[PDB]
Structure 1
């Protein structure tokens, strides 16, 4: 099954475990969307 409430522990482990580079996803009419760059 699922061990309880250590899931948020691993979630914050992931968040904290991560020169930043983003990538364009959409682009149209002078408006773009960029995935990545967690510290902008």
Structure 2
């Protein structure tokens, strides 16, 4: 299963494969945490 750093490129495409919608991952006391929204 040996593979060089070429695999790197793949993820750059994968992240580049993905409007921007995030998801609330927790909320409390007027503070929310949102995963996603890389361009925010």
TM-score by length of 2: 0.76
Paired residues in the alignment total 40
Deviations 1:11-30 (A, max 9, x none): 11112111211111100011
TM-score by length of 1: 0.76
Q: Over aligned residue pairs, what C-alpha RMSD do you find?
A: 1.1
Matched, 1:6 2:29: no
Gaps of 5+ in 2: none
